[PDB]
Amino acid sequence: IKQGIREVILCKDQDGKIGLRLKSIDNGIFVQLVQANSPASLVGLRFGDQVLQINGENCAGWSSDKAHKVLKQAFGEKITMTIRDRPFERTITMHKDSTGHVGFIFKNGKITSIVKDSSAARNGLLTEHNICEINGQNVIGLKDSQIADILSTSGTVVTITIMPAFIFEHIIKRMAPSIMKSLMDHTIPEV
Structure with a gap:
């Protein structure tokens, strides 16, 4: 468990998927599931990680639904994420x-x-x-x-x-x- 904030660069697969589901928790956004052989798995996202930012925008207060809307709407080229390592673990x-x-x-x-x-x-x-x-x-x-x-x-x-x-x-x-x-x-x- 790193006390780091790190940054990840993601890229949709052929099917426009990154392999991730996000959950809203105490007004932050956390990784609920990382799919095997997905971009999210390859960049090293882990169950329990907090997403602080997506494409430079702050996640605080977002609903799960909105976080998922954001990931879809973005150009799969480069989605940048700002991650706090597994804070609840x-x-x-x-x-x-x-x-x-x-x-x-x-x-x-x-x-x-x-x-x-x-x-x-x-x-x-x-x-x-x-x-x-x-x-x-x-x-x-x-x-x-x-x-x-x-x-x-x-x-x-x-x-x-x-x-x-x-x-x-x-x-x-x-x-x-x-x-x-x-x-x-x-x-x-x-x-």
Whole structure:
């Protein structure tokens, strides 16, 4: 989680798509979904990112509907965006024990308990938090078992990006869960 504001230059695909849905939150604009193999995925936009500006204009107070209208109406040539990195999320680094455990229980991607004397415990992992990413990869809408598989396949150092559930639940509202399983980019970034 960069304390940066960074700028991204986007470019519509063949079909005039950038692969993004935006949500209005406390009078700002936040990324609800990034589609796999989209311009938004390629420039590195992430679930939870705040869009401060689109083409130099301020997003504050905008509705979701208006943000979407703006993206459409613009010339796909270059859409410039001003992005605050994942402001509602934090990252926790954990280390796996000898049994390959970090030390929590989660249900539906939400952490619900912290195992005593775990690394999760030592690092102050919190419950009532939705997991958004593991080791920099988005896991939102994946099954509980597949999140377990990513933690397994992970090397000892486990990095988890987490969001307060009340905030997470506000962001995903009005998005059919299949879209999240099927469309939300769940890939490691390209170099």
